[PDB]
Coordinates of C-alpha atoms in Angstrom, one line a residue:
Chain A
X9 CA 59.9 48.8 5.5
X10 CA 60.1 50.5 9.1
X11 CA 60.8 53.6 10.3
X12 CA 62.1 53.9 13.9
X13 CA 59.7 52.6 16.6
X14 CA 60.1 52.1 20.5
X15 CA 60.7 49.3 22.4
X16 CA 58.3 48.9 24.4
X17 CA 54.9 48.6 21.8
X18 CA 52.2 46.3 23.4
X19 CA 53.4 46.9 26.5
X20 CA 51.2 49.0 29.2
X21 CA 53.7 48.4 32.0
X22 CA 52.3 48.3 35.1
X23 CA 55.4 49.7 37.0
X24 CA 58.7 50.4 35.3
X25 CA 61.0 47.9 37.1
X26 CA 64.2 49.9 35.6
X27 CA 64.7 53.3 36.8
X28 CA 61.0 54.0 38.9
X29 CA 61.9 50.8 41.1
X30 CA 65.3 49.2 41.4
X31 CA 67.2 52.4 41.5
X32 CA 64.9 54.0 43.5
X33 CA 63.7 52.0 47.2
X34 CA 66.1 49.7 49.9
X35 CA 63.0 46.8 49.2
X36 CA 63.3 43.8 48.6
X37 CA 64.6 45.1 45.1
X38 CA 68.0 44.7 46.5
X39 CA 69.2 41.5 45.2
X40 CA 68.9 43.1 41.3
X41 CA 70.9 46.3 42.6
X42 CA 74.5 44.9 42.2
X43 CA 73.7 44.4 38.3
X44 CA 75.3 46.1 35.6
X45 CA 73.5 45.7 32.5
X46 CA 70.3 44.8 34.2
X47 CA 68.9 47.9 32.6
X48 CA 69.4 46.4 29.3
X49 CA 67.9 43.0 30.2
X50 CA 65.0 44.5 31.3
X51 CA 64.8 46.4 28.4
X52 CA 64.3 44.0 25.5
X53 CA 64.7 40.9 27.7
X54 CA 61.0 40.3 26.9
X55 CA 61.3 39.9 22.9
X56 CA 61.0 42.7 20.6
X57 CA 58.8 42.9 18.0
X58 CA 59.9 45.0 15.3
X59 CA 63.6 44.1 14.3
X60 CA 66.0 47.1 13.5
X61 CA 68.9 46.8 11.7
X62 CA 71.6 47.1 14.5
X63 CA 75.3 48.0 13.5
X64 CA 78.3 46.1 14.8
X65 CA 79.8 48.1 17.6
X66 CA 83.4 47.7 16.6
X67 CA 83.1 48.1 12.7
X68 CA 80.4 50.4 12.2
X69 CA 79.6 49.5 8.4
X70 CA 78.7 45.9 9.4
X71 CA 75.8 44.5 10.5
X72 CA 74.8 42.1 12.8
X73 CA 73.3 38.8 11.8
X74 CA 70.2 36.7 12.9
X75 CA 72.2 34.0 14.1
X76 CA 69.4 31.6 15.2
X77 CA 66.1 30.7 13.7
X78 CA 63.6 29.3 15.7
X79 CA 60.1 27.8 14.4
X80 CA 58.3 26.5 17.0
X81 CA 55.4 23.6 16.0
X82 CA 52.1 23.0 18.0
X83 CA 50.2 19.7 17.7
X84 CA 46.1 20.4 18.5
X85 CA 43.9 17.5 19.1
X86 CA 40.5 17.0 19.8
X87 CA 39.8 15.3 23.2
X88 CA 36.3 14.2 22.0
X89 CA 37.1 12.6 19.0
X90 CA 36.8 9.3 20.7
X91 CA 33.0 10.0 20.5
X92 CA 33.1 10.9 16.9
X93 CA 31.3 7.8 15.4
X94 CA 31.5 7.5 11.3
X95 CA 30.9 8.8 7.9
X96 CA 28.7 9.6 5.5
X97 CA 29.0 9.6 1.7
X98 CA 25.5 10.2 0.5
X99 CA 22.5 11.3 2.1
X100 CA 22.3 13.6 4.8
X101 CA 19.2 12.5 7.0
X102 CA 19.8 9.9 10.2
X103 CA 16.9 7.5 10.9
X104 CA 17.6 6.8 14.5
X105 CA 14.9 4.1 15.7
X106 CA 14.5 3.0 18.7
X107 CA 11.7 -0.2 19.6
X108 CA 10.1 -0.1 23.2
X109 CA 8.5 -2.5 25.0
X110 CA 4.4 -3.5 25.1
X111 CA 2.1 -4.2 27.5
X112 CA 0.7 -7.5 29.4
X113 CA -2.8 -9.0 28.6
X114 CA -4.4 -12.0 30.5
X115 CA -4.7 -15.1 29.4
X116 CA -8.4 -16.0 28.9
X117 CA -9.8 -19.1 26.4
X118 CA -13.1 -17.7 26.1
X119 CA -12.7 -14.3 24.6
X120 CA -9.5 -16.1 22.6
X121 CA -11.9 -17.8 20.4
X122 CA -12.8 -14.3 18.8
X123 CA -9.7 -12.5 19.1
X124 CA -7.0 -14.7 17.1
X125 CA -6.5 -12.1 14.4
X126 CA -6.3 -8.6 16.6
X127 CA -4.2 -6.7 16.1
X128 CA -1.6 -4.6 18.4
X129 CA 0.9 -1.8 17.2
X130 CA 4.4 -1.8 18.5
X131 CA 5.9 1.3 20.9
X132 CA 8.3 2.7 18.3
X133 CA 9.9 6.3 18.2
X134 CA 12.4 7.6 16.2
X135 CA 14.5 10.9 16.0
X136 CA 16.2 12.9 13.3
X137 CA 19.6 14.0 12.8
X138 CA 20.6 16.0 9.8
X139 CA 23.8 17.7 8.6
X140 CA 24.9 21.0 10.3
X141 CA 28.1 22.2 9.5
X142 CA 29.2 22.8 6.2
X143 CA 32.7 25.2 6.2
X144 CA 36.2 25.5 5.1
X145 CA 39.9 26.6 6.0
X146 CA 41.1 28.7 3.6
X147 CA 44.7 29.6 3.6
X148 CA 47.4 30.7 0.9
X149 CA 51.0 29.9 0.6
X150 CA 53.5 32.0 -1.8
X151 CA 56.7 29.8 -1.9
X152 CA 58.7 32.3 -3.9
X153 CA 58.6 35.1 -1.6
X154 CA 59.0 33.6 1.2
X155 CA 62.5 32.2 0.4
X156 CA 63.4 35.9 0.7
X157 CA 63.3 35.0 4.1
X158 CA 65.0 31.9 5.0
X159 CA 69.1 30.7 4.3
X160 CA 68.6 27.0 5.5
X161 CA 66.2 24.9 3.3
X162 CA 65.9 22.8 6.2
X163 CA 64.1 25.6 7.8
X164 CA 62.0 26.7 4.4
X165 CA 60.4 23.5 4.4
X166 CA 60.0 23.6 8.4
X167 CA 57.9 26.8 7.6
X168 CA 56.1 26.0 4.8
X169 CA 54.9 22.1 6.8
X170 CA 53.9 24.4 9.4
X171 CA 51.6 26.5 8.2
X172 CA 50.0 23.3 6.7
X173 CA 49.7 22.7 10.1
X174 CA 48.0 26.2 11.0
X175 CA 44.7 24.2 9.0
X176 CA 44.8 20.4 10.5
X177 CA 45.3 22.2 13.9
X178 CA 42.1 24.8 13.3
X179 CA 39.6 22.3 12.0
X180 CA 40.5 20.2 15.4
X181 CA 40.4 23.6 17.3
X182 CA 36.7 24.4 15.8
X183 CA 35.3 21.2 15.7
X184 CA 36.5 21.0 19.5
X185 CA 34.1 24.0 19.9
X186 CA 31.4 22.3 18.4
X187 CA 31.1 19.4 20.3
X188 CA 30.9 21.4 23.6
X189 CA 28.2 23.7 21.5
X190 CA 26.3 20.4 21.3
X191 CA 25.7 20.2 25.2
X192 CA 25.4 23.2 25.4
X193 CA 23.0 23.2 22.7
X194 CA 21.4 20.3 24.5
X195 CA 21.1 22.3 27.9
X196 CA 19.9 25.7 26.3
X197 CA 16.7 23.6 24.6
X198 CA 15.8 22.1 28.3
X199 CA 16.9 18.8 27.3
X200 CA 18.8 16.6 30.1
X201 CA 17.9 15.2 33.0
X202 CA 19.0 18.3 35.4
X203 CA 20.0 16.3 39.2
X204 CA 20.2 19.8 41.3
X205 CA 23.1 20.0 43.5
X206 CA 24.9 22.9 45.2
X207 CA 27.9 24.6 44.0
X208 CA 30.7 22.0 45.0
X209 CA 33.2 25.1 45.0
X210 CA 31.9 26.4 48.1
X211 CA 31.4 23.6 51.0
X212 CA 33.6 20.4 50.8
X213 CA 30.0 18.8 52.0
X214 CA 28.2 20.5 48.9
X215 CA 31.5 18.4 46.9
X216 CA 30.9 15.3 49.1
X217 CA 26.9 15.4 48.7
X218 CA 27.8 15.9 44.8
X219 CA 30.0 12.5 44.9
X220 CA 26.7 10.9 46.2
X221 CA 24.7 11.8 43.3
X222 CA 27.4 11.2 40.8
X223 CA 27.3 7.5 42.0
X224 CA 23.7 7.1 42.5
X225 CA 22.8 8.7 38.9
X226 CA 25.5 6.1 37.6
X227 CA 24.5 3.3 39.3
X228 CA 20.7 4.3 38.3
X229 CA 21.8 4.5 34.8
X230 CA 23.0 1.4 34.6
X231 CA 20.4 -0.9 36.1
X232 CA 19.9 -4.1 34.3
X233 CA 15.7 -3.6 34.1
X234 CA 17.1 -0.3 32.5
X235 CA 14.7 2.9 33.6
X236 CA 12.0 4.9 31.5
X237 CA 13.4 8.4 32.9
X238 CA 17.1 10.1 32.5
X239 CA 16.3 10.6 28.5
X240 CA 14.4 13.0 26.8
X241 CA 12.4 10.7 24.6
X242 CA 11.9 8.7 27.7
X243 CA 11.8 4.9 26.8
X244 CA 13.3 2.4 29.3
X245 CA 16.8 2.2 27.9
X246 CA 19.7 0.8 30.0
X247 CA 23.2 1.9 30.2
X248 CA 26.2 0.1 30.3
X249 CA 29.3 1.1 32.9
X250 CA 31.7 1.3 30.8
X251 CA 30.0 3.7 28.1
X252 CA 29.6 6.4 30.7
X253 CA 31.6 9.3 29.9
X254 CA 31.6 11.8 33.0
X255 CA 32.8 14.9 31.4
X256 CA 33.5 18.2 33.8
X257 CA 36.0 20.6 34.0
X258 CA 39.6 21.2 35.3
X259 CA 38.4 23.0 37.9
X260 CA 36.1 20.8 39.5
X261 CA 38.8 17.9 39.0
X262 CA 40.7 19.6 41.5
X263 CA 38.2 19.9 43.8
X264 CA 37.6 16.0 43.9
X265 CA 41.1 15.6 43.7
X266 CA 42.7 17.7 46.6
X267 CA 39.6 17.3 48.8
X268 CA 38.3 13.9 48.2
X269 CA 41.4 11.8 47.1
X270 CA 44.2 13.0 49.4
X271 CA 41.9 12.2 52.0
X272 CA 39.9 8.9 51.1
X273 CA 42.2 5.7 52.2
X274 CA 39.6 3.5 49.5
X275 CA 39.9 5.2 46.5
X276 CA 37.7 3.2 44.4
X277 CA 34.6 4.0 46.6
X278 CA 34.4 7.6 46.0
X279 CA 35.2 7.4 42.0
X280 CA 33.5 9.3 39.7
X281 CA 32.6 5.8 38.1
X282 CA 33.1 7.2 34.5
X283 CA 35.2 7.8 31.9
X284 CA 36.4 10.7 33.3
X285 CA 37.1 13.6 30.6
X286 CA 38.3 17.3 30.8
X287 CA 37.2 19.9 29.3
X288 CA 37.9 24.7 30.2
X289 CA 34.1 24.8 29.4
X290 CA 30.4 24.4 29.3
X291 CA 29.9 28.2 28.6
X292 CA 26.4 28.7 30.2
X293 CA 25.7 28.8 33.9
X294 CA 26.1 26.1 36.9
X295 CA 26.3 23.7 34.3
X296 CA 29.1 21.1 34.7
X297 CA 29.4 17.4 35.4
X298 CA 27.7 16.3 32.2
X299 CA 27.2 11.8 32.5
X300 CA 26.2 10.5 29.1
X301 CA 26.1 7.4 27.1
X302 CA 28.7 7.5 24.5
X303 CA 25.8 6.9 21.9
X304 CA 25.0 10.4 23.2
X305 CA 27.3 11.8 20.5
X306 CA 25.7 11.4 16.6
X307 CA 28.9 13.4 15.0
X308 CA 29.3 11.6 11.8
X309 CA 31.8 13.2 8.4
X310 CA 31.1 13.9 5.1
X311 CA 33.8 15.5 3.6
X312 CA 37.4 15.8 4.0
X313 CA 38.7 17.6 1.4
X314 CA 41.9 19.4 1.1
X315 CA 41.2 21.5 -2.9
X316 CA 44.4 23.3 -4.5
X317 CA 44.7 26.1 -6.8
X318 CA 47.9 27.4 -8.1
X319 CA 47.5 31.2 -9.1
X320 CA 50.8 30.8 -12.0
X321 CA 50.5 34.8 -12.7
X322 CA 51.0 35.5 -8.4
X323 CA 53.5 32.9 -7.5
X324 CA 51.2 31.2 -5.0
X325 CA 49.2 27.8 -3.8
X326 CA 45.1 28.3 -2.2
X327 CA 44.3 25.8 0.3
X328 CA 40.7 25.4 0.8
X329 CA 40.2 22.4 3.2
X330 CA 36.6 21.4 3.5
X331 CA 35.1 20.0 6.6
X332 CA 31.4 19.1 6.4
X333 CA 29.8 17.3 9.6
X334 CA 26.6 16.4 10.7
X335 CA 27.1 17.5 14.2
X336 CA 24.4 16.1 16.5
X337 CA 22.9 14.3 20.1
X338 CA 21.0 11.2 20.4
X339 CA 17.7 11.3 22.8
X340 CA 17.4 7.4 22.7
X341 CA 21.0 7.8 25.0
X342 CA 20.6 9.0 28.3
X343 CA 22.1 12.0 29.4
X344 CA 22.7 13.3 33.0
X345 CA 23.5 17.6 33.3
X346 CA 24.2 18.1 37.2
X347 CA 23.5 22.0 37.5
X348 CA 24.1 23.5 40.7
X349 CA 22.7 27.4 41.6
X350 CA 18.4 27.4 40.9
X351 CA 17.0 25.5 38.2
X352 CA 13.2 25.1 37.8
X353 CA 10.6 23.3 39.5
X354 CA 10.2 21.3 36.2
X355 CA 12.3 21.0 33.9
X356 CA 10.2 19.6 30.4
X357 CA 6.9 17.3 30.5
X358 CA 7.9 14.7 28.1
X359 CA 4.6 13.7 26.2
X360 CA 3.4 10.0 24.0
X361 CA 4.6 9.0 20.9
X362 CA 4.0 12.5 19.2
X363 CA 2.9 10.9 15.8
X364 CA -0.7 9.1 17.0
X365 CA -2.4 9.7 13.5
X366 CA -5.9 8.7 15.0
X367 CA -8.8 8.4 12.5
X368 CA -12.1 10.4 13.2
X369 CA -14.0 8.7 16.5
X370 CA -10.8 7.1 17.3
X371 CA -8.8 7.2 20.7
X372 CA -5.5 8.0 21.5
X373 CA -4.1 8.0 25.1
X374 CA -1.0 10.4 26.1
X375 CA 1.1 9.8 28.7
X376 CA 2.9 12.5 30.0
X377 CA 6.6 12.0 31.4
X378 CA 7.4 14.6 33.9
X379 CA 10.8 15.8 34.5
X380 CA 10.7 17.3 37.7
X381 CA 13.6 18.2 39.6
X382 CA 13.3 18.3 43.5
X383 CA 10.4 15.7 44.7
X384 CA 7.3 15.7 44.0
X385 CA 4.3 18.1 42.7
X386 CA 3.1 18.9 39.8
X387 CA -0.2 17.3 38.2
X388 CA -0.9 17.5 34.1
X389 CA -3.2 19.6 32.5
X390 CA -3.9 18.1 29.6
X391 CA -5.3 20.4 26.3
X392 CA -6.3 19.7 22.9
X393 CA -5.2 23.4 21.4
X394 CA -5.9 22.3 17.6
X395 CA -9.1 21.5 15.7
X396 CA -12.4 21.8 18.0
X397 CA -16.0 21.0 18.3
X398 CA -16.1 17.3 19.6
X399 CA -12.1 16.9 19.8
X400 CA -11.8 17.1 23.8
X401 CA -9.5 15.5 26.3
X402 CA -10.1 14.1 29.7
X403 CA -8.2 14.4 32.8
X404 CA -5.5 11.5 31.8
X405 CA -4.6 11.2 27.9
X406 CA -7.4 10.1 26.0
X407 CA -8.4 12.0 23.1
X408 CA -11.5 10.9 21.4
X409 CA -11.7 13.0 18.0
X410 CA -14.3 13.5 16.1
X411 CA -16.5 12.8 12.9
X412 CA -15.7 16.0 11.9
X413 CA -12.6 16.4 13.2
X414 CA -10.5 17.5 10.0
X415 CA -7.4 19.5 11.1
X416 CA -3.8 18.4 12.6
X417 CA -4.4 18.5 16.7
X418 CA -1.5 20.0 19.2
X419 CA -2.1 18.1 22.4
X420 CA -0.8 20.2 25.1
X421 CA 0.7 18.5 28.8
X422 CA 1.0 21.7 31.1
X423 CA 2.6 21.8 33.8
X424 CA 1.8 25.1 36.5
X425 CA 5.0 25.6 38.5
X426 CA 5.8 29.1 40.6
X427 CA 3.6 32.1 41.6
X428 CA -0.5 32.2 40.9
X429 CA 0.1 35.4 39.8
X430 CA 2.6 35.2 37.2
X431 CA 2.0 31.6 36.4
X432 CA 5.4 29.9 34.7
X433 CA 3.9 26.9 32.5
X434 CA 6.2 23.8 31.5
X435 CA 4.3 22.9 28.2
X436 CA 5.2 19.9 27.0
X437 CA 3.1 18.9 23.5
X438 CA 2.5 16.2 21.2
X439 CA 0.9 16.2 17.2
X440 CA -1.7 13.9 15.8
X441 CA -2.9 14.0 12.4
X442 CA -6.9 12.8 12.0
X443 CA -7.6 10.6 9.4
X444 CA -10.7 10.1 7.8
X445 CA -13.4 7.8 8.8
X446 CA -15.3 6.9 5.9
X447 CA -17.7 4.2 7.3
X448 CA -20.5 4.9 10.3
X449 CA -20.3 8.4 8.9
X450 CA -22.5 11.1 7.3
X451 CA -26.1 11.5 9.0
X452 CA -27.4 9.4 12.1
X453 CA -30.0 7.8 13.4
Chain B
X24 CA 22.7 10.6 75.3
X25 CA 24.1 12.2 72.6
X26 CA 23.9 14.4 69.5
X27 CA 25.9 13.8 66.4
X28 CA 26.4 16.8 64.0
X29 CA 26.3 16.1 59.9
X30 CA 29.7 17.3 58.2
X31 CA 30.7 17.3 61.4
X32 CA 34.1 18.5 59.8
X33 CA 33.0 21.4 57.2
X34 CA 35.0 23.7 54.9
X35 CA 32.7 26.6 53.8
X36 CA 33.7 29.1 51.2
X37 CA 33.4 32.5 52.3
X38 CA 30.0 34.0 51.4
X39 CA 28.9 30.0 51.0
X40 CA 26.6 28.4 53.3
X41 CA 26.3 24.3 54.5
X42 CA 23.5 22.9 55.4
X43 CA 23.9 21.2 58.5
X44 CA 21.7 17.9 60.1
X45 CA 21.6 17.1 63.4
X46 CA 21.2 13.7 64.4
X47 CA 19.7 13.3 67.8
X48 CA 20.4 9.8 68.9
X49 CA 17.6 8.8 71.8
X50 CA 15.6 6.2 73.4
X51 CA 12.0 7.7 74.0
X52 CA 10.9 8.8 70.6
X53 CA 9.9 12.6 71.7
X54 CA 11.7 14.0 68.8
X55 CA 13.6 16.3 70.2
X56 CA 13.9 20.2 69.6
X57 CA 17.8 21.5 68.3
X58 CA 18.9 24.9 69.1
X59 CA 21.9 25.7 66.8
X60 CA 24.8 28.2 67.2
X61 CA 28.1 28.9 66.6
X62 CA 31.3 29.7 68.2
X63 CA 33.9 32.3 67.2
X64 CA 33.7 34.9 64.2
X65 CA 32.4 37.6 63.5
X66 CA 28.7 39.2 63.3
X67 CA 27.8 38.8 59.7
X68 CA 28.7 34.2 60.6
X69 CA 25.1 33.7 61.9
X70 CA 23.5 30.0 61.5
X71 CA 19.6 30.3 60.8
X72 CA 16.9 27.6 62.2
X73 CA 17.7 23.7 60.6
Chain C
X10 CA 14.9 6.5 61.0
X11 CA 15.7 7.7 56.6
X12 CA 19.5 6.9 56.4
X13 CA 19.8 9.6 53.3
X14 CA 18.5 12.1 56.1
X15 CA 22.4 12.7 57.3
X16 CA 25.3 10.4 58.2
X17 CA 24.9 10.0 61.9
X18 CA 21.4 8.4 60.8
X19 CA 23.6 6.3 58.1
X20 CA 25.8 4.7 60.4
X21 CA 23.0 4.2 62.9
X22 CA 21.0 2.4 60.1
X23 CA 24.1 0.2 59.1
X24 CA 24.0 -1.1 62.8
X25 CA 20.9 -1.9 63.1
X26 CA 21.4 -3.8 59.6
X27 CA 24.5 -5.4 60.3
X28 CA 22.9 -6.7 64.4
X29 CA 19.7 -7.4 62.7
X30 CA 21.6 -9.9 59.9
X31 CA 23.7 -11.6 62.8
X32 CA 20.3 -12.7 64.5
X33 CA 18.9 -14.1 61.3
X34 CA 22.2 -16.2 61.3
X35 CA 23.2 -17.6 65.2
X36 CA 22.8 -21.4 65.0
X37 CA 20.0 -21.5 67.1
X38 CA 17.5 -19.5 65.3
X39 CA 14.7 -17.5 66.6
X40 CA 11.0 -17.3 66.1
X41 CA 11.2 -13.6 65.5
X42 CA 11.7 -13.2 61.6
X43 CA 9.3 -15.6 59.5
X44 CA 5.5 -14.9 59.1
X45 CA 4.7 -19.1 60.4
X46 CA 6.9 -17.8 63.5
X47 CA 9.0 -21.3 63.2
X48 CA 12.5 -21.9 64.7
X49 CA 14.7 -21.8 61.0
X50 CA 17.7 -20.5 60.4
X51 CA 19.7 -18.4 57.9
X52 CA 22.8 -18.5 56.9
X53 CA 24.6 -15.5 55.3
X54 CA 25.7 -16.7 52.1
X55 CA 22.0 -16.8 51.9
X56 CA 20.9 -13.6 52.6
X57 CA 20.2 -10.6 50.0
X58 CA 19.4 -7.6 51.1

C-alpha cells in the first residue's frame, strides 16, 4: 500500500488560484473572495488520485466510507462500418474482375467472306486483394481478487461487463484506424484522382470555388456514358448518386456550414451531393474531401474469435479476441482525393492492360492514361527498359518484339514534369511476358 | 460602362490570399487593361497584377 | 466570353442564354437560327440545351 503523497500529482498548475491569486489582487477574482472553504474546493475539487484513509473528525478511531461507486460505461463504434462488405471463411486471395468495352469495325461484305472465324480478345483487367491484418486483444480478468473491492454484486458484475467492453470497444477503435490508413494508404502510393483546390480555410471564395468542384466531380462521376478517367485502373466505369460517400472532416464541415448554409436561401443547390461522413483525420497533408464509390472499400472478415483460458492455479480467465481482416481498396471504383496546398504537375501515367503476353514478332500497343492535374502538357515517352536487340517502341504504344526476344519486357510511359535540370519523371510502367514463336523461325532467307 | 469584381464580397484569412477576376463589361471588344488596388490597411495588404 | 472565367461573366452568359432561348420561341419565328434560314419556330418544351 501507500505511503503519504501530495495532492496535487499530475498537476503542473499553471497559476495557483488559492493563495497566489484570490487572496492576493482586487481583479476580477472578487466574486470567489467572500468564500469560506473555497480553499478546500480548490484543493481536491479536481479528483484525487490516490485515496487516503481519512479519519472521522468527531470519533477519531472511525473511518470514513466510500459512500458512492461510480462505473462509468463508453459505447465505441465505427462510423465506417457501413462500408465493411462481407466475410471470408477460406481463402485469402480476391479475384476482382472487371470487363471493359471493345472497339468498332466497319461493316464490309467483301473482306467478310475471309474473316468469319477471326478472332478478337476482350478488354479485361483484374486486381488483387489479399489479407492484411491478422491481430488480437488480449486481456485478463481475476474474478477472485477483485471482489476485494466491490460490496454491491450489482456493481461486481457492472465491472467485470465492462472490461469485456475495454475489447469490443478497441477492436472498433483500431479497425477505425485502419480504414482511414486505407486512404491514406491510397494517397501515399499516388493513387486518386487529385482535383487541386486551395485551402478552403483561408478565403470563403477558396470554400465557394471548392463547392464548385465538389459538384462538378460528382456530377462527372456519375454520368450515364460513365468516364475512362477518375480511377486508377482507368476503365470507363460509371457511378451511381447515391453510392457517393463524401468523407471530410469536422473542421471543414463547419466551414460549409457557418459560411455556406447560414447564408444560401436554396439549400439543395450548394450540397455536397454525397453521403456526407465525418471523420478527426486524414493524417497526411492538404488531404481532405475524399468522394468515392462505396465499392471503394474491399474490407471483408475472417475471424471473430473470442478464445478463453482459465489459469485454475492463479484464479483468473485470458481473453484473447482474434480479429483477422483483409483490409483493402478497389481501383475498378472511382475515387476523388481533393488536395489543396501544391501537388504535382502529374500525378501517375496510368499504362495498358499490364499483362500483354505477346509472342516473338508480335505487336502490342500501350495506351498511356495520364493523370494530370492542372490542364494540359505533358507528352509520353514511351521505353522498352527490359530485353533488347530488336524489342523497340515507337512514339505511341506499339511494341514489336522480337525473334529472339526471350526475357520478361518493362514498358516504361514517362512523363518529364518540372525543371531541365533536375528533371522529376512520372513513370508509369506496364509488363509483358514474350512467348515463343516456333513457326517462321530459325534462319531466313 | 461598368466593371464587376469576382467575390465581390471576400473573407480572407490573414496570411491567405484570393484570387480576384475582374469582369470588364463593354461594347467595343478592345479588351480592356485593369489596374487593381486596395483601400485601407496596412503596408504588408498589397494586391499584385491579376 | 468563358463563363467558368468568374461570375460577372456567368451571369452575363446566362443572359445571353436565357434572351437567346426567348427568340428561338416568339410565335413569329425568325430566319436567324436554322442553317436553310426558313421562318420555324421552337417552342420550349422542345428545347435542350
Amino acid at each position: 500500500t501507500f505511503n503519504d503523497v501530495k495532492t496535487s500529482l499530475g498537476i503542473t498548475e499553471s497559476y495557483d488560484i488559492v493563495n497566489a491569486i484570490r487572496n492576493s489582487q482586487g481583479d476580477n477574482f472578487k466574486s470567489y473572495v467572500p468564500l469560506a472553504t473555497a480553499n478546500n474546493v480548490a484543493e481536491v475539487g479536481a479528483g484525487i488520485l490516490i485515496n487516503q484513509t481519512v479519519q472521522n473528525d468527531f470519533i477519531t478511531s472511525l473511518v470514513d466510507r466510500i459512500g458512492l461507486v461510480v462505473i462509468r460505461q463508453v459505447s465505441l463504434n465505427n462510423p465506417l462500418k457501413k462500408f465493411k462488405k462481407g466475410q471470408i471463411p477460406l481463402g485469402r486471395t480476391i479475384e476482382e474482375i472487371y470487363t471493359d468495352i471493345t472497339k468498332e469495325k466497319q461493316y464490309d461484305a467483301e473482306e467478310a467472306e475471309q474473316k468469319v472465324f477471326e478472332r478478337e480478345m476482350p478488354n479485361v483487367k483484374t486486381l488483387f486483394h489479399e489479407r492484411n491484418r491478422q491481430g488480437f486483444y488480449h486481456q485478463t480478468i481475476q474474478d477472485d481478487s477483485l471482489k476485494t473491492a466491490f460490496v454491491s454484486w450489482g456493481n461486481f458484475e457492472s465491472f467485470v461487463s465492462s472490461i469485456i467492453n475495454a475489447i469490443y470497444n478497441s477492436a472498433e477503435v483500431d479497425e477505425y484506424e485502419y480504414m482511414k490508413l486505407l486512404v491514406d494508404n491510397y494517397y501515399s502510393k499516388g493513387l486518386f484522382t487529385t482535383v487541386k483546390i486551395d485551402e478552403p480555410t483561408s478565403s470563403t471564395g477558396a470554400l465557394t470555388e471548392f463547392v464548385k468542384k465538389m459538384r462538378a466531380t460528382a456530377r462527372k462521376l456519375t454520368l450515364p456514358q460513365g468516364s475512362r478517367d477518375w480511377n486508377s485502373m482507368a476503365v470507363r466505369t460509371r457511378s451511381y448518386m447515391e453510392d457517393l460517400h463524401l468523407i471530410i472532416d469536422a473542421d471543414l464541415e463547419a466551414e460549409l456550414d457557418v459560411d455556406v448554409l447560414a447564408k444560401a436561401f436554396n439549400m439543395n443547390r450548394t450540397d455536397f451531393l454525397g453521403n456526407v461522413t465525418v471523420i478527426d483525420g486524414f493524417a497526411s497533408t492538404g488531404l481532405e474531401a475524399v468522394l468515392v464509390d462505396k465499392d471503394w472499400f474491399m474490407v471483408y472478415d475472417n475471424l471473430h474469435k473470442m478464445e478463453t483460458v482459465r489459469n485454475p492455479r492463479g484464479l483468473y480467465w485470458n481473453y484473447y479476441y482474434h480479429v483477422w481482416q483483409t483490409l483493402s481498396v478497389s481501383r475498378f471504383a472511382n475515387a476523388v482525393a481533393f488536395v489543396s496546398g501544391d501537388v504535382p504537375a502529374v500525378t501517375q501515367v496510368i499504362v495498358s492492360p499490364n499483362i500483354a503476353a505477346v509472342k516473338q514478332g508480335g505487336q502490342q500497343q500501350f495506351t498511356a492514361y495520364v493523370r494530370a492535374t492542372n490542364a494540359k502538357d505533358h507528352k509520353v515517352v514511351w521505353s522498352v527498359e527490359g530485353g533488347s536487340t530488336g524489342t523497340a517502341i515507337t512514339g505511341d504504344g506499339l511494341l514489336s518484339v522480337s525473334g529472339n526476344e526471350d526475357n520478361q519486357l518493362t514498358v516504361k510511359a514517362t512523363v518529364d514534369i518540372g525543371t531541365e535540370d533536375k528533371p522529376k519523371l512520372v513513370v508509369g510502367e506496364a509488363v509483358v511476358s514474350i512467348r515463343p514463336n516456333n513457326a517462321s523461325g530459325g534462319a531466313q532467307a
